[PDB]
Amino acid sequence: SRKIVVVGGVAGGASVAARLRRLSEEDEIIMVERGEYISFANCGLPYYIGGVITERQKLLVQTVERMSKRFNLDIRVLSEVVKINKEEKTITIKNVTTNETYNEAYDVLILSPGAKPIVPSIPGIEEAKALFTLRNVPDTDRIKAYIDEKKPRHATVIGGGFIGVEMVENLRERGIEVTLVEMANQVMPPIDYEMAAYVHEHMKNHDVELVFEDGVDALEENGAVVRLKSGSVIQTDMLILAIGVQPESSLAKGAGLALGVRGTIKVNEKFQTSDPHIYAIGDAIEVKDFVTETETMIPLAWPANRQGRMLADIIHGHTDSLYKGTLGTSVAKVFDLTVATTGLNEKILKRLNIPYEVVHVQANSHAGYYPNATPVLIKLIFNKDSGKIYGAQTLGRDGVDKRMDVIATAIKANLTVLDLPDLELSYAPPYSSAKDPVNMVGYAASNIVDGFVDTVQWHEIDRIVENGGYLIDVREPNELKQGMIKGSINIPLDELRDRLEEVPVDKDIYITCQLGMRGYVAARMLMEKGYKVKNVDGGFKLYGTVLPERIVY
Amino acid sequence: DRWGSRKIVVVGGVAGGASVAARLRRLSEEDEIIMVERGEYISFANCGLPYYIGGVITERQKLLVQTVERMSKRFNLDIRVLSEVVKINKEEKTITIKNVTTNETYNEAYDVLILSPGAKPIVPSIPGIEEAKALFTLRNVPDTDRIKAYIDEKKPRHATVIGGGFIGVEMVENLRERGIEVTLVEMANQVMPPIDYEMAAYVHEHMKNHDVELVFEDGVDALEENGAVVRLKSGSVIQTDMLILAIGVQPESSLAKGAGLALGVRGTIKVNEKFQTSDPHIYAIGDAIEVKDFVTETETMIPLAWPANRQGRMLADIIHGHTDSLYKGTLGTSVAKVFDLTVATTGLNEKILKRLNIPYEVVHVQANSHAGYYPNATPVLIKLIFNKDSGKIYGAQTLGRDGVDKRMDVIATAIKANLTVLDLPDLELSYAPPYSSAKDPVNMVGYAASNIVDGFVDTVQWHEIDRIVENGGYLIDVREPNELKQGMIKGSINIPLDELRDRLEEVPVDKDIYITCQLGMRGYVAARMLMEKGYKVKNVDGGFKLYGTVLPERIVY
Ligand SMILES: Cc1cc2nc3c(=O)[nH]c(=O)nc-3n(C[C@H](O)[C@H](O)[C@H](O)COP(=O)(O)OP(=O)(O)OC[C@H]3O[C@@H](n4cnc5c(N)ncnc54)[C@H](O)[C@@H]3O)c2cc1C
Numbered sequence A: 001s002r003k004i005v006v007v008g009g010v011a012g013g014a015s016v017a018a019r020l021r022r023l024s025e026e027d028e029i030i031m032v033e034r035g036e037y038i039s040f041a042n043c044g045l046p047y048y049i050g051g052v053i054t055e056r057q058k059l060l061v062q063t064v065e066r067m068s069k070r071f072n073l074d075i076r077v078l079s080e081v082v083k084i085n086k087e088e089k090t091i092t093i094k095n096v097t098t099n100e101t102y103n104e105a106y107d108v109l110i111l112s113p114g115a116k117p118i119v120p121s122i123p124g125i126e127e128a129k130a131l132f133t134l135r136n137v138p139d140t141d142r143i144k145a146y147i148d149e150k151k152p153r154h155a156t157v158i159g160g161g162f163i164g165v166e167m168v169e170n171l172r173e174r175g176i177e178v179t180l181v182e183m184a185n186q187v188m189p190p191i192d193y194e195m196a197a198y199v200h201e202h203m204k205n206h207d208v209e210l211v212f213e214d215g216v217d218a219l220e221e222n223g224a225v226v227r228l229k230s231g232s233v234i235q236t237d238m239l240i241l242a243i244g245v246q247p248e249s250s251l252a253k254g255a256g257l258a259l260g261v262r263g264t265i266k267v268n269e270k271f272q273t274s275d276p277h278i279y280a281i282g283d284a285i286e287v288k289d290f291v292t293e294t295e296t297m298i299p300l301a302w303p304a305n306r307q308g309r310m311l312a313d314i315i316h317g318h319t320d321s322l323y324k325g326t327l328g329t330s331v332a333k334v335f336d337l338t339v340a341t342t343g344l345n346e347k348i349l350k351r352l353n354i355p356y357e358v359v360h361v362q363a364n365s366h367a368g369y370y371p372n373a374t375p376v377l378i379k380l381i382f383n384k385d386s387g388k389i390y391g392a393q394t395l396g397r398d399g400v401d402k403r404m405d406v407i408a409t410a411i412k413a414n415l416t417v418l419d420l421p422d423l424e425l426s427y428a429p430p431y432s433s434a435k436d437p438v439n440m441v442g443y444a445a446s447n448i449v450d451g452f453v454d455t456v457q458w459h460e461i462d463r464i465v466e467n468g469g470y471l472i473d474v475r476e477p478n479e480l481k482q483g484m485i486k487g488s489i490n491i492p493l494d495e496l497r498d499r500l501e502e503v504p505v506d507k508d509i510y511i512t513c514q515l516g517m518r519g520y521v522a523a524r525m526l527m528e529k530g531y532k533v534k535n536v537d538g539g540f541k542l543y544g545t546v547l548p549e550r551i552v553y
Numbered sequence B: 001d002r003w004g005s006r007k008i009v010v011v012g013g014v015a016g017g018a019s020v021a022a023r024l025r026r027l028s029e030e031d032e033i034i035m036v037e038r039g040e041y042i043s044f045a046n047c048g049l050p051y052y053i054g055g056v057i058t059e060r061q062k063l064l065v066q067t068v069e070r071m072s073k074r075f076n077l078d079i080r081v082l083s084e085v086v087k088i089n090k091e092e093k094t095i096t097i098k099n100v101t102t103n104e105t106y107n108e109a110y111d112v113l114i115l116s117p118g119a120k121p122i123v124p125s126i127p128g129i130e131e132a133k134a135l136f137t138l139r140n141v142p143d144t145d146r147i148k149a150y151i152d153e154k155k156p157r158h159a160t161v162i163g164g165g166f167i168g169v170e171m172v173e174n175l176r177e178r179g180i181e182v183t184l185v186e187m188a189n190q191v192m193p194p195i196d197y198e199m200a201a202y203v204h205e206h207m208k209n210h211d212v213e214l215v216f217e218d219g220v221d222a223l224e225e226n227g228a229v230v231r232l233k234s235g236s237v238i239q240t241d242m243l244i245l246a247i248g249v250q251p252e253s254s255l256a257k258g259a260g261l262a263l264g265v266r267g268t269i270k271v272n273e274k275f276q277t278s279d280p281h282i283y284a285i286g287d288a289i290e291v292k293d294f295v296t297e298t299e300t301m302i303p304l305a306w307p308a309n310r311q312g313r314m315l316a317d318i319i320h321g322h323t324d325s326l327y328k329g330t331l332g333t334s335v336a337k338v339f340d341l342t343v344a345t346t347g348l349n350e351k352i353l354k355r356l357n358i359p360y361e362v363v364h365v366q367a368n369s370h371a372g373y374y375p376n377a378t379p380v381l382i383k384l385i386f387n388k389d390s391g392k393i394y395g396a397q398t399l400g401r402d403g404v405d406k407r408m409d410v411i412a413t414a415i416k417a418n419l420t421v422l423d424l425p426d427l428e429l430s431y432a433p434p435y436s437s438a439k440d441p442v443n444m445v446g447y448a449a450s451n452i453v454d455g456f457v458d459t460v461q462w463h464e465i466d467r468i469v470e471n472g473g474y475l476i477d478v479r480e481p482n483e484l485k486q487g488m489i490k491g492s493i494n495i496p497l498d499e500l501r502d503r504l505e506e507v508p509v510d511k512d513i514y515i516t517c518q519l520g521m522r523g524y525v526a527a528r529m530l531m532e533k534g535y536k537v538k539n540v541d542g543g544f545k546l547y548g549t550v551l552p553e554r555i556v557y
């Protein structure tokens, strides 16, 4: 029989506590949470504010009474752990209502304190009456009550990451005008620039004003005026701050436990801190990314849930399966669009100086001859020699979550781009095609790995054309509606073989089509004829989405 | 070195044939590639045919993915539609082709021959079938045009579908779509042979709710009154206006037989690891060939479009000496839309594993398609079959109204990557409220299976419980008292999970304890608690929900 004390009672904390009970009836399990609720769905909060989740009670999954009863758990809400006394193996707990303190001994201590919102040093941030960050239920009730009473016409969201975007969507749907202010040149950092171009274009069609490479310089007239670094002024009725989170590691810091990147709690493969009787899981810990084993911080719910269930097994379960890192699989709903990412993106790979190739493949969510088929764009990032997958990103209106999950599975199973075409996924017209989008991205990546095709990227083509590259557009004339890449010469794929005598043999040939497929087929033709040829990855559609001001008519 | 150009002849211009031809052209401009197809159309979507009949697909031209003119131009292919290969002269290295239009026959020399002739519908020798006027099978566009013309001109009010396979079911759904009353006649005691009995029970419910009459363990004995009366083996009669036969397929291997090529199981064409038949110059792919199942490496026939397409694409590389990647065998992943319900399966089912004397365990877990607090969350049921020692996954079955395709693809991907059930909980899938839960249903079935592999819980199946109760087992129902109005298993004693720890005194130490709840989850937690207190306890896998769906006649109210 052990005494196990768990600090934090949401994702990581509730997960470990429940499994621990299932593993042993004998242990005394104490769960200490500083807020009023345990196991609340914090990820549902934006949807509650948006009125998508109409019932507040639904956000409260399990009650303290029911859970403490079901798992014979000593659950202490509104109790803030203020100090860890690691030589004494006790913690000091403070009552939130009375401020009175008391000590509680432990045999084993588990920290799952989560992460807290980052607040920047903006002049006037303390005079701001209508400034909200979103982390818990009370914060949510505050925003909800604010919107009820003051009926804001316009909201400004500061920070264009996952939280910020969901907040934008949910305020928009309530009928509130929205401006998103972002320091970077794009929304959602985990995804790459060209992918974010689709997202920006979609958010604009829903009347969100996007302000890039700008920040708040000051908050005037009580926060109602936002002065931007660019000189622009935003009149607004509320301000949502969503600029990142930092580990809640002050407890570990106070106890002299070793820290890591961004002040995360440093843990070993079994979630043990630098102290043998103290463990840590959740957003607060340093994780190694699965792909490169670089130490990082990845604050997502799936990992916090898995780490808690695993730690329960480490303490009281059978064989130790060790944590082999986080892939970082995430998904977001952006109005009608689903956006998903896994593994590393080009920006990180470039920062680490790792060589990579990428392929952009757009295919339908299901058989095109079946009603309501919609595009799915997949970007695969891989090693050109081994075919190792570094990461992937996907977006579209449907069947995005399906394809991300398949590829995420592939990466954790250590499959290469060469294995992707062999994944036998379910085919019926309503759900997929004879070759699924995932198989198709596998084929496109394999052709590059095997040397059947050479490609160039959207950010290269204009420069290549300026420097004497011969650019052939192989789209049918009817496809030329939305424009072309400057320098383009149209020779439709079906005429090309008869019109060979028109392609110069002393020049580098670049081919583009709408999505890249026919450009690939034209490339293969000309390669087998002796030409030096490269296909433009993603075709005109990607190019024109990312660089719309460069389109020629 | 490099590549010497050759003449490649492809027999069949749909799934297998089209995919091989296209890739072969991408690999070499110099090769002469001839595609011979007996129908009018190449690369049509026969998987779409039922939907065209149901009017879900409204443009016939939409079933024609590629036209002869377009494709032959794009790939510089000599495509000969309405041309039937009637004989292979393997020593002469020629084939005889009959142009069906002009009646002219000629011989075509080949260096390489690729056979992708497919599977034909089994037509049974039922008396009266010859005189049956409104009897149809479905394979190609002309069959579809005939059935559709019949519906429009003759206005049937009732249809009988003989055969409850995946294709029979699709016909049923699409006939209901047009406003036709439908009776489905199956010989087995369940629709869709790939799925197990208790999973089929859910499918039957959904079809009966859409007003389909299901007739099981009955076959058509005769077709009387010119096909307007179907007389069943039991003796019952079905008056109908039209009959659709969907009783399975058999390989189109007459050409192989005639050429003296080796045949594999069920008359399929036998091929080696490289799709080579018993003649070095003749290759074969598609529904017509014998493939190994991925899971057991048993020779079998699996007529699905994905394998055909994959095989065709692989063969093209093999022909060009790229033999690194050879065919690993088919997992047999299939998905079906049944009215509002999606049904998916992969690998081997219980019926097959018994047939092979393979020890297995199963788990049945029902979970939500996505976060429960997020609107329109619907239950998803996954049955997972595995080895209790290794954790090797033998197969999976899934059903639900949404989020079914996704889970099967993940599990199918896990199986092909050689992951055990112990790895399923470690699959980091995307979590956002509209798409999943913090632990996806796949993670969940993985945990359930891992608990069985690790010995944390012992379970009994829906088909074992009643006999165990008859033999003295003590069955405790851990649901709340209110939940019992939905019915219960004979012999059950009610002790609510929450109260159970408080009422341990009422649990006998001299009996084998069996636990049931609604879905199995609460039963498992109760099982865990009692084992820890030193009781010998087992959980009823799937709980009462499963039991009552599969054996409703046994429910005590
Ligand atoms: C609005 C919002 C939406 C999100 N949406 C998603 C999503 O869609 N998908 C996804 O994967 N992730 C999402 N996340 C992130 C996800 O919620 C976290 O990664 C996950 O909750 C981390 O779990 P945790 O146990 O580490 O921390 P938390 O779940 O934050 O739990 C930490 C708990 O410990 C308590 N605590 C901290 N210090 C003390 C102390 N000293 N004493 C007592 N208690 C203490 C806190 O009160 C808190 O309740 C979202 C987060 C937010 C804020």
Ligand SMILES: Cc1cc2nc3c(=O)[nH]c(=O)nc-3n(C[C@H](O)[C@H](O)[C@H](O)COP(=O)(O)OP(=O)(O)OC[C@H]3O[C@@H](n4cnc5c(N)ncnc54)[C@H](O)[C@@H]3O)c2cc1C
Pocket (backbone or CB within 6 Å): A427, A428, A429, B011, B012, B013, B014, B015, B016, B017, B036, B037, B038, B039, B046, B047, B048, B049, B050, B083, B084, B085, B086, B116, B117, B118, B119, B138, B139, B140, B167, B252, B255, B285, B286, B287, B288, B303, B304, B305, B306, B308
């Ligand atoms: C109604 C229907 C629905 C289906 N739905 C699905 C589904 O949802 N999912 C799924 O995976 N599978 C489905 N299938 C099966 C799928 O269509 C087949 O597995 C696939 O087409 C088989 O590929 P194949 O190339 O072997 O044969 P086929 O596509 O049948 O092609 C064989 C071609 O060869 C021609 N041919 C044969 N002999 C000769 C000859 N001697 N000379 C010249 N030509 C010849 C035939 O006319 C035929 O066109 C369905 C089938 C049908 C009929």
Ligand SMILES: CC(C)(COP(=O)(O)OP(=O)(O)OC[C@H]1O[C@@H](n2cnc3c(N)ncnc32)[C@H](O)[C@@H]1OP(=O)(O)O)[C@@H](O)C(=O)NCCC(=O)NCCS
Pocket (backbone or CB within 6 Å): A009, A010, A011, A014, A015, A018, A019, A022, A038, A039, A040, A041, A042, A043, A044, A061, A062, A301, A305, A309, B364, B365, B366, B438, B439, B444, B447, B448, B451, B519, B520, B521, B524, B542
């Ligand atoms: C729900 C919560 C309170 C408790 O978790 P839990 O008790 O593990 O409950 P779960 O449903 O996750 O696990 C179900 C258990 O039953 C098992 N199970 C489920 N269905 C089963 C079935 N049909 N048959 C047999 N076993 C089953 C699972 O294997 C698991 O047991 P194990 O972990 O001992 O193997 C906790 O996860 C929580 O706090 N959740 C919300 C936090 C969160 O995710 N937040 C992010 C914001 S949305």
Ligand SMILES: CC(C)(COP(=O)(O)OP(=O)(O)OC[C@H]1O[C@@H](n2cnc3c(N)ncnc32)[C@H](O)[C@@H]1OP(=O)(O)O)[C@@H](O)C(=O)NCCC(=O)NCCS
Pocket (backbone or CB within 6 Å): A360, A361, A362, A434, A435, A440, A443, A444, A447, A515, A516, A517, A520, A538, B014, B015, B018, B019, B022, B023, B026, B042, B043, B044, B045, B046, B047, B048, B065, B066, B305, B309, B313
């Ligand atoms: C369509 C059909 C002719 C296939 O021909 P195909 O030329 O292989 O056509 P696909 O669209 O599959 O093209 C995929 C090719 O383009 C490549 N590709 C696709 N998208 C690409 C992109 N964005 N960039 C670069 N290449 C791309 C793939 O890598 C692949 O080439 P590869 O095979 O040389 O690697 C054939 O599968 C068919 O007729 N299908 C319908 C018949 C059928 O399946 N019937 C059964 C019932 S549905």
Ligand SMILES: Nc1ncnc2c1ncn2[C@@H]1O[C@H](COP(=O)(O)OP(=O)(O)O)[C@@H](O)[C@H]1O
Pocket (backbone or CB within 6 Å): A120, A158, A159, A160, A161, A162, A163, A164, A181, A182, A183, A184, A186, A187, A188, A189, A214, A215, A216, A242, A243, A244, A245
């Ligand atoms: N001063 C600032 N003004 C505007 N945006 C900012 C500022 N500082 C950071 N950001 C942006 O806010 C976003 C933070 O999002 P992220 O790191 O995903 O955290 P979260 O998911 O909690 O929003 C990033 O896109 C980042 O570039």
